[PDB]
Write a structure and sequence with these properties.
Chain E: It is found in: Plastid, Chloroplast thylakoid lumen. The structure is cut from a larger assembly and holds 10 protein chains of 9 kinds. Chain B is mainly α and 41 residues long. Chain B has 2 helices and no strands. Classes of the chains: A mainly alpha (731), B mainly alpha (41), C mainly alpha (35), D mainly beta (64), E mainly alpha (165), F mainly alpha (74), H alpha+beta (80), I mainly alpha (31), J mainly alpha (94). At the A-E interface, strand 3, helix 18 and helix 23 of A face helix 1, helix 2 and strand 3 of E. Bound molecules: chlorophyll A (CLA) (8 copies), the ligand CCCCCCCCCCCCCCCC(=O)OC[C@H](CO[C@@H]1O[C@H](CS(=O)(=O)O)[C@@H](O)[C@H](O)[C@H]1O)OC(=O)CCCCCCCCCCCCCCC, beta-carotene (BCR) and iron/sulfur cluster (3 copies).
């Protein structure tokens, strides 16, 4: 009974809880016995190395499985008539019909059809054979081993970095902006110019011959002479065929804009040019902060100088540099917020602007990627706000931030929470009212009485980008406008050709249904933010619990006194916000999937007419697209969709199981377990066997965590199964 | 009589009577002026 | 796929041998009294 | 003579801990002994525990 | 035309929708007598449907590709193209009535707050006072603006209780 | 076979509902966790977060859970 | 309604009490705070509301489904 | 083993002592209140964490606070 | 040109070495 | 316990006041035949050590791998058997 090596108090627990809490608090290094700041930072650094090695191993495994049991080589020849293979299937429980049903893409046996889009990405970056994939997997394997050795090395006393080294924010930002971001982008540009671009033109360029192949006919001379325009002489023709030399070109840094007519994706030359410009800008930005060369900036002085007069912002940003550098939770919250927003941006840009060849034609992959990134973004956003609350309850110092932006924003937290609640109430009241009004008028057979508000603002913005479907004739919609003439011979031709076409997702047509669903999304975001912000601002204390900060970030409650204090900690606020985040992401993914489902089948009228009322959402989307999924296996037989049907029921079961931990609380189970213990201690033969840990019911916080985990797992599994089965059984 | 009028002035009685009056007024407005999608003045 | 026999050996090793060994070791370690 | 405000005088609470922080109450009585919180203040706003009276120090109340 | 929308008067889908609804009603009517109660009810429904469609087409509403009326929620855009009665005028009407009810409630609460027993006045409403305040709430815009410019419509932040941060 | 399966499902649900209601009735007065549960009354939220947690320990809470199980069974 | 019940079944009284505190501050800022101090529903009342809404929603859903199906094919 | 603390805001009403179900608090002489007595927690090892003492404290804020910490066989209320 | 059996064996051996490095890092982190 | 009357507590016999009874245990060394007992204790001679008994369990682990690489194919498991034709898919795919 001493497993929690990091917690002596937990080791003394004689119940099973000791094991439970021994695993849920293993990564909270700040709360471990005999923990200092230097050891904390060093442990985090080594953990980062381990995580990097894990990521490298995961990528290497994906590459190895695609090169060993996939059909990448066959898919290259026919990227539109062959389903990518993820990996093989070796399940002893499979029956003969199951083994025969899972054999698809010309495989020797049962396999899994890929849905992550790695085939399109690897095909777009220049990979063509299985040997290249195997080489990449081996290289990533060696890289992972190298990172593991680095993590072990930096844990030794001779290579242990000091705490001050971790606080050197200027040096770290300089190296990350100029090297981690700029140099990496420049190297990617080099790869695209040397491999991706030549490979897309039917010319193979590998390690064995990249030194004898010219990326451009006029090698390096125009670059050093300044005649950079010579690198965009003749781009790929509009009738170019990917992976071949018909209608090719010699340019390597173009800016046509739009999509490739055959692959329906962005031009490789455009992406190379983008990465080159990004690398230059990032390197320049990296040469900003002061290190040891007498030049640069001091973030502390910049923050102390950002104090507007008249005292509108109080002391301004005085002491913020130390508030961010000293607190790890503040940095983690900022990083999580930024990463989540970038994940959402990635999801929103990969479907409207496909970057990989033959990716827009893969309806299953596009939907899966969008949903995956949106769910990841939601979880990361919840984590960002949770860590912000942790910062307020564990690293915030009122004396060090007296009068700055933090103290002032905390001084009027009531106004913030009140306005968030008002916005949420308004959005909910009106969105639900309009939807119910439309449902009632639809039921009574009077669709003409529907309240269909035209999204004139979004349509106006779309017209500003070149869409002429709304008759606005604004900026890019007018050929004689200044912005239209400025880029007339640059990127506007392709951009307009792609935005005015209904065959792609570049700014889709919107109507009243989009208006209502967008307001529903605004509702979800506002309520989730309200819960998270209320929990972070009230983490230190409220009127019901003035000394909440003395009890930590997470605790069961404060007893039934003072009327009751159930779910009063900041952890509980994050817990309640996870449900809202799941609901918001569900609404977003439902909207995206239904709109694209109607677009792929050439029937936008279905969504344009059935999305204005909830019955259309439940009947024309959920019930209509669930026929093939629930038919994966039936008393007549089974097909390749049986795995998705089983996963569908599996998710439903996990979700319902979580409902138990969510509704039932600790009290009933404690008495039940006591009765069970009495039964075991009085049953003959079984008396010879004793328990090492006293069985007890799950903790209140532990129960909430288990219920939330079950709810989230069931939610994700159910939607993933439905999404893949619905978009895969049709296309 | 005073106690009866005081009981009629309680929150539940007044709430139900007010809701009934508002609902009746709205129902008659829709009965005499039906299908009012916009404010056509 | 090359070496078709490998999955038939690796799948039971990762799903039957490795989990049993890991669970036994973890159970023996979380109840050692003196680690 | 007597320390603190006289009985029946409106005072404002200065203790952020108190449920009636920044709120006014009536001084019921003031103890004339070396007591940490001798000012008894009654309120018309019951707290979460249903209490309407509390004890405060001489520096935790402001007249009017 | 505002955002590629066609007026319901010249919309073919709108006319087809009206024709289909009337056709369904007549099909249901064919299974009854000529002067029976169900026949009269169905005829009344048909008349109401025709009147509704005619009014929507005459009011100048905009119809989309689906043939259903669409509302323009944007000042200027709705004012210059004659669609102010879609959201603008209803917004003004709502704001007025909502402010009327809110101001009446605020005045009643502030008036009974000075009574020796306000909680009872809250559970047992004063009908005459509530009626007078409801009538006075019709001039809520003027009263609210006067109170705002007077400074009596707000409470000092130093007099409102707040959490211990 | 389907009738056999559904009948056993019915028996299982009825048994669980009976277990919840009977447990609440039998432990409404006292229990090993709370020896003076009768003093707290019949309808109380809990007995604080001590002893790991006493949430929904009263008889009223047992009825509250029995309602859900009865709904499932019916 | 059924889904609505979940709000009252997975939540606690402390969160709603603090949210009500902020809303009360907003009301006090405009001199429209009521004397009958708004308080969050008690733990027992929260459970009762959640169970009542859960059963009402589920039973009404089954009622509508059963009646529509039997009246359309019966 | 929870942490029970008593603050000088106590008025010596002895309600928390009477509400304790495991006899953890007691009244000792004091001179900071009119009652001339303060509450104390000499037997915190027997505290279960029911927080009944806090529900009985009439001072605002509470004069007696319980901070749940390491769980033991007694604090968990286990009879087996 | 599908990958041969020897390539799979070499990859598995390299993975074994990587796993050894990983377990060493884990042991160092435990300390 | 000295329960000669109504006293169920005794410090001098605290062992009996806590219910520490075997209830069903009975010591008896006359039962298993000597010839059969010797055979079994002889068969399980060195198998009484943790390392050695775990070795027997390790054999089961080898049998698991042996089944996958040989036993599964000998029982004609569907996963180790062959496959017949295939399908095209929803649209013009594979
Ligand atoms: C040029 C010098 C240099 C470089 C290259 C790095 C590089 C790195 N450092 Mg380091 N560091 C440096 C100098 C440098 N550092 C100095 C001087 C100091 C002392 C002041 C530090 C102190 C330091 C600390 C304390 C830590 C690091 C860490 C890291 C790693 C960051 C985590 C990661 O791998 O994500 C990779 C990040 C990127 C690739 C850039 C992100 C770009 C965006 C967000 C992604 C989107 C781009 C694109 C769209 C993706 C498409 C790809 C898709 C097709 C798959 C990373 C490899 C962390 C670590 O993990 O430890 C191992 C860490 O803890 N550094
Ligand atoms: C860079 C990302 C990152 C990092 C470094 C951290 C780091 C940390 N977090 Mg944090 N967090 C993050 C993101 C991150 N978080 C995100 C995205 C969320 C939103 C979900 C959260 C929400 C969160 C909360 C609420 C809390 C922390 C806490 C902590 C601290 C302790 C964590 C711990 O105890 O480990 C323990 C690790 C675990 C217990 C693993 C959890 C088990 C998972 C959830 C179950 C997964 C099951 C699996 C999916 C099932 C598969 C299905 C299949 C079987 C069918 C720690 C410093 C805690 C803290 O700060 O203490 C005060 C705390 O309470 N985090
Ligand atoms: C379908 C289920 C459901 C519904 C409808 C809601 C609704 C709401 N939640 Mg909630 N929530 C839910 C599930 C749900 N939640 C779940 C499962 C969880 C996890 C436990 C949460 C956790 C949660 C938190 C933590 C918070 C909310 C908040 C809110 C409110 C946000 C304000 C708003 O949107 O205005 C719109 C209002 C509505 C949509 C309610 C409908 C209005 C009704 C229908 C009108 C009444 C008409 C009629 C007279 C009905 C009476 C009939 C009767 C007399 C017989 C809102 C009332 C936040 C809040 O309180 O905001 C301030 C808040 O902080 N929720
Ligand atoms: C015709 C059907 C209809 C119905 C049934 C409702 C019903 C409702 N509306 Mg609504 N509304 C409608 C049409 C409708 N509205 C239209 C056509 C518009 C124009 C777009 C609005 C704009 C609107 C707004 C801006 C708000 C509502 C709000 C509300 C809710 C409370 C309203 C109220 O007066 O409470 C009782 C009254 C009070 C408690 C005090 C008075 C509060 C009012 C709203 C303030 C008016 C004066 C103020 C200075 C106006 C400035 C607002 C500012 C944002 C510019 C309620 C459920 C409110 C809400 O959503 O709650 C969060 C809200 O603020 N509605
Ligand atoms: C679908 C969700 C779900 C599930 C699966 C359960 C399951 C269970 N509940 Mg429960 N309950 C739920 C929802 C759920 N509940 C909700 C929402 C509430 C709130 C009202 C409650 C409230 C509640 C109460 C109050 C009680 C229960 C009780 C029980 C247990 C009864 C014993 C039994 O059924 O035997 C067997 C278990 C099952 C049939 C569950 C499925 C297990 C499968 C069939 C076995 C699979 C084996 C596994 C896959 C192999 C291992 C694989 C490896 C990877 C681990 C049982 C485990 C009662 C109890 O404690 O037991 C007496 C009890 O009193 N529940
Ligand atoms: C915020 C949500 C909302 C909004 C803005 C509207 C708005 C509208 N609804 Mg609708 N409705 C809603 C929710 C909503 N509804 C819900 C939730 C339901 C389900 C119960 C319905 C069911 C419904 C039906 C069945 C009908 C409408 C109708 C109407 C229109 C009639 C206007 C009118 O009554 O004439 C003018 C009214 C006045 C001038 C009175 C104003 C003065 C009042 C008394 C002040 C009230 C003070 C409190 C109008 C545009 C009718 C219609 O014809 O559709 C076009 C109609 O048949 N609604
Ligand atoms: C994280 C990446 C990853 C993942 C998720 C998988 C997943 C899978 N592999 Mg695979 N593998 C990987 C990497 C990965 N592999 C790498 C890099 C190699 C090159 C050596 C291989 C070589 C390989 C072979 C030869 C075979 C599989 C097979 C399989 C399947 C059955 C698992 C098994 O028993 O084989 C065992 C897997 C190994 C012996 C090597 C995997 C070692 C990885 C890198 C460990 C990663 C641990 C992770 C980072 C830490 C997470 C913590 C977790 C352990 C709790 C399964 C779907 C079998 C199959 O094809 O099924 C039909 C099969 O025979 N893999
Ligand atoms: C609620 C946000 C909102 C939004 C998104 C818009 C958006 C728009 N308005 Mg508008 N407007 C608003 C509020 C808003 N308005 C309000 C509250 C009023 C009342 C004062 C007006 C009064 C108004 C008028 C009078 C006009 C517009 C016009 C326009 C359109 C072109 C003007 C423009 O944006 O050029 C750039 C804006 C800059 C500030 C530069 C445009 C789609 C014009 C139009 O109808 O288009 C032809 C027009 O003349 N609006
Ligand atoms: C992958 C890894 C595989 C590992 C395999 C380990 C196998 C076990 C092992 O080596 O044990 C090592 C021990 C060491 O004992 C030792 O045996 C020593 C003698 S000698 O060294 O064996 O000669 C002796 O001196 C000493 O006391 C004793 O401890 O040897 C044994 O006693 C094993 C004998 C096993 C006899 C039982 C077999 C199963 C019987 C089933 C009955 C029904 C079946 C039908
Ligand atoms: C609580 C807390 C925390 C956390 C927080 C968070 C989580 C935040 C966030 C947030 C977010 C999540 C945000 C976002 C954002 C965004 C923005 C701010 C933007 C913008 C804009 C602009 C400026 C743009 C412009 C443009 C361009 C550029 C071009 C095109 C057009 C347009 C207009 C689009 C911390 C720790 C820190 C502190 C303490 C506590
Ligand atoms: S019901 Fe549970 S969470 Fe709520 S106050 Fe009681 S012990 Fe705490
Ligand atoms: S929490 Fe319970 S056991 Fe502990 S001191 Fe308070 S009343 Fe006594
Ligand atoms: S209940 Fe509070 S005031 Fe009364 S004796 Fe205990 S600590 Fe002091």
């Amino acid at each position: 009974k001493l497993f929690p090596k990091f917690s002596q108090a937990l080791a003394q627990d004689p119940t099973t809880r000791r094991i439970w809490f021994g695993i849920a608090t293993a990564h909270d290094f700040e709360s471990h016995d005999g923990m200092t700041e230097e050891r904390l930072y060093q442990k985090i650094f080594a953990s980062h190395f381990g995580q990097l090695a894990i990521i490298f191993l995961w990528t290497s495994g994906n590459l190895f499985h695609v090169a060993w049991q996939g059909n990448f080589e066959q898919w290259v020849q026919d990227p539109l008539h062959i389903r990518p293979i993820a990996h093989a299937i070796w399940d002893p429980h499979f029956g003969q019909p199951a083994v025969e049903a899972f054999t698809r893409g010309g495989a020797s046996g049962p396999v899994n059809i890929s849905t992550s889009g790695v085939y399109q990405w690897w095909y777009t970056i220049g990979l063509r054979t299985n040997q290249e994939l195997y080489t990449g997997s081996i290289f990533l394997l060696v890289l992972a081993a190298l990172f593991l050795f680095a993590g072990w090395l930096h844990l030794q006393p001779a290579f242990q970095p000091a705490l001050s080294w971790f606080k050197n924010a200027e040096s770290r930002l300089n190296h990350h902006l100029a090297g981690l971001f700029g140099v990496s982008s420049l190297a990617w540009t080099g790869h695209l110019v040397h491999v991706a671009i030549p490979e897309s033109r039917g010319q193979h360029v590998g390690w064995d011959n990249f030194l004898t192949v010219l990326p451009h006919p006029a090698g390096l001379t125009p670059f050093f002479t300044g005649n950079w325009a010579a690198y965009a002489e003749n781009p790929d023709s509009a009738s170019h065929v990917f992976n071949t030399a018909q209608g090719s070109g010699t340019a390597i840094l173009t800016f046509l804009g739009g999509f490739h007519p055959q692959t329906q994706s962005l031009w490789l030359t455009d992406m190379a040019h983008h990465h080159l410009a990004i690398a230059v800008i990032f390197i320049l930005a990296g040469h900003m902060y002061r290190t040891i060369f007498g030049i640069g900036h001091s973030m502390r002085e910049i923050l102390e100088a950002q104090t507007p007069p008249s005292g509108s912002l109080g002391a301004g940003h005085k002491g913020l540099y130390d508030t961010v550098n000293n607190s790890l939770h503040f940095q983690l919250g900022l990083a999580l917020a930024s990463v989540g927003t970038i994940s959402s941006l990635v999801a929103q840009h990969m479907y409207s602007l496909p970057p990989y060849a033959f990716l827009a034609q893969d309806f299953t992959t596009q939907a899966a990627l969008y949903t995956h990134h949106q769910y990841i973004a939601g979880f990361i956003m919840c984590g960002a706000f949770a860590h912000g609350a942790i910062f307020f309850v564990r690293d915030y110092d009122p004396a060090q931030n007296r009068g700055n932006v933090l103290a002032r924003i905390l001084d009027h937290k009531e106004a913030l929470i009140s306005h968030l609640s008002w916005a949420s109430l308004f959005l909910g009241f009106h969105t639900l009212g309009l939807y119910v009004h439309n449902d009632v008028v639809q039921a009574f057979g009077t669709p003409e009485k529907q309240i269909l508000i035209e999204p004139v603002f979004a349509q106006w913005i779309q017209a500003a980008h070149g869409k002429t479907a709304y008759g606005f004739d604004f900026l890019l919609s007018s050929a004689t406008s200044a912005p239209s003439l400025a880029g007339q011979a640059l990127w506007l031709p392709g951009w307009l050709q792609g935005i005015n076409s209904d065959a792609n997702s570049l700014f889709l047509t919107i109507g009243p249904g989009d208006f209502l669903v967008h307001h529903a999304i605004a509702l979800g975001l506002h309520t989730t933010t309200l819960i998270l912000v209320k929990g972070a601002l009230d983490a230190r204390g409220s009127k019901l619990m003035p000394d909440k900060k003395d009890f930590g970030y997470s605790f069961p409650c404060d007893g039934p006194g003072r009327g009751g204090t159930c779910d009063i900690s900041a952890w509980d606020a994050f817990y309640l916000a996870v449900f809202w985040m799941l609901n918001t992401i569900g609404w977003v993914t439902f909207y995206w999937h239904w709109k694209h489902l109607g677009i792929w089948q050439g029937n936008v009228n279905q969504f344009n007419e059935s999305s204005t009322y909830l019955m259309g959402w439940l009947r024309d989307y959920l019930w209509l697209n669930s026929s093939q999924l629930i038919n994966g296996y039936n008393p007549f037989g089974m097909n390749s969709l049986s795995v998705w049907a089983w996963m569908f029921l599996f998710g439903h079961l996990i979700y319902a199981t979580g409902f138990m931990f969510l509704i039932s609380w600790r009290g009933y189970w404690q008495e039940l377990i006591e009765t069970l213990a009495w039964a075991h201690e009085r049953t003959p033969l079984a008396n010879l066997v004793r328990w090492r840990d006293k069985p007890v019911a799950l903790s209140i916080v532990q129960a909430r965590l288990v219920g939330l985990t079950h709810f989230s797992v069931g939610y994700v599994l159910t939607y993933a199964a439905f999404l893949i089965a619905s978009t895969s059984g049709k296309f | 009589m005073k106690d009866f009028t005081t009981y009629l002035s309680t929150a539940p009685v007044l709430t139900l009577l007010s809701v009934t009056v508002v609902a009746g007024l709205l129902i008659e407005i829709n009965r005499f002026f039906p299908d009012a999608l916009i404010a056509a003045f | 796929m090359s070496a078709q026999f490998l999955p038939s050996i690796l799948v039971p090793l990762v799903g039957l041998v490795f989990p049993a060994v890991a669970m036994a070791s973890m159970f023996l370690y979380i109840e050692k009294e003196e680690i | 003579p007597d320390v603190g405000p006289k009985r029946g005088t409106q005072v404002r609470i200065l203790r952020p801990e108190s449920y009636w922080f920044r709120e006014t109450g009536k001084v019921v009585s003031v103890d004339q002994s070396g007591i940490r919180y001798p000012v008894v203040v009654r309120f018309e706003k019951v707290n979460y525990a249903g209490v309407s009276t509390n004890n405060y120090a001489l520096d935790e109340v402001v007249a009017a | 035309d505002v955002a590629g929308l066609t007026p319901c008067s010249e919309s073919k889908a709108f006319a087809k929708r009206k024709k289909n609804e009337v056709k369904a009603l007549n099909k249901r009517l064919k299974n009854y007598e000529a002067d029976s109660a169900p026949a009269l009810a169905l005829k009344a429904t048909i008349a109401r449907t025709e009147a509704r469609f005619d009014k929507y087409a005459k009011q100048g509403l905009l119809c989309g590709t689906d043939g259903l009326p669409h509302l323009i929620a944007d000042p200027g855009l709705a004012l210059r193209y004659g669609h102010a009665g879609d959201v603008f005028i209803p917004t003004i009407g709502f704001i007025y009535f909502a402010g009327w009810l809110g101001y009446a409630g605020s005045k009643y609460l502030q008036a009974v707050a000075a009574t020796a027993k306000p909680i009872e006045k809250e559970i047992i409403i004063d009908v005459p006072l509530a009626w007078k305040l409801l009538w006075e709430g019709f001039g809520w815009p003027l009263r609210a603006f006067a109170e705002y410019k007077n400074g009596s419509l707000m409470e000092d932040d130093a007099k409102i209780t707040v959490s211990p941060r | 076979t389907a009738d056999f399966l559904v009948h056993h499902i019915h028996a299982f649900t009825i048994h669980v509902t009976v277990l919840i209601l009977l447990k609440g009735v039998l432990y409404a007065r006292s229990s090993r966790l709370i020896p003076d549960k009768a003093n707290l009354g019949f309808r109380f939220p809990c007995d604080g977060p001590g002893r790991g947690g006493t949430c929904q320990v009263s008889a009223w809470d047992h009825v509250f859970l029995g309602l859900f199980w009865m709904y499932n069974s019916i | 309604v059924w889904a609505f019940s979940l709000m009252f079944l997975f939540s606690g009284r402390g969160y709603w009490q603090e949210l009500i505190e902020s809303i009360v501050w907003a009301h006090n800022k405009l001199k429209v705070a009521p004397a009958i101090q708004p308080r969050a529903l008690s733990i027992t009342q929260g459970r009762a509301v959640g169970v009542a809404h859960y059963l009402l929603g589920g039973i009404a859903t089954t009622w509508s489904f059963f009646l529509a199906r039997i009246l359309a094919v019966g | 083993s929870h942490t029970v603390k008593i603050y000088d805001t106590c008025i010596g009403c002895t309600q928390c002592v009477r509400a304790c179900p495991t006899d953890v608090l007691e009244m000792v002489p004091w001179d900071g209140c009119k009652a001339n007595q303060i509450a104390s927690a000499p037997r915190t090892e027997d505290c279960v964490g029911c927080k009944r003492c806090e529900s009985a404290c009439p001072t605002d804020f509470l004069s007696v606070r319980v901070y749940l910490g390491s769980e033991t066989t007694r604090s968990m209320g286990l009879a087996y | 040109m599908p990958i041969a059996d020897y390539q799979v064996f070499t990859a598995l051996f390299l993975a074994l070495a990587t796993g050894i490095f990983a377990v060493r890092l884990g042991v160092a982190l435990y300390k | 316990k000295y329960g000669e009357e109504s006293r169920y507590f005794d410090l001098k016999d605290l062992e009996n006041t806590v219910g520490s009874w075997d209830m069903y245990g009975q010591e008896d060394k006359s039962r298993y035949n000597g010839l059969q007992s010797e055979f079994f204790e002889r068969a399980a001679n060195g198998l009484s050590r943790r390392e050695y008994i775990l070795g027997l369990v390790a054999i089961g682990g080898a049998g698991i791998l042996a089944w996958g690489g040989k036993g599964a194919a000998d029982v004609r498991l569907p996963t180790v058997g062959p496959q017949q034709p295939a399908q095209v898919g929803p649209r013009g795919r594979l």
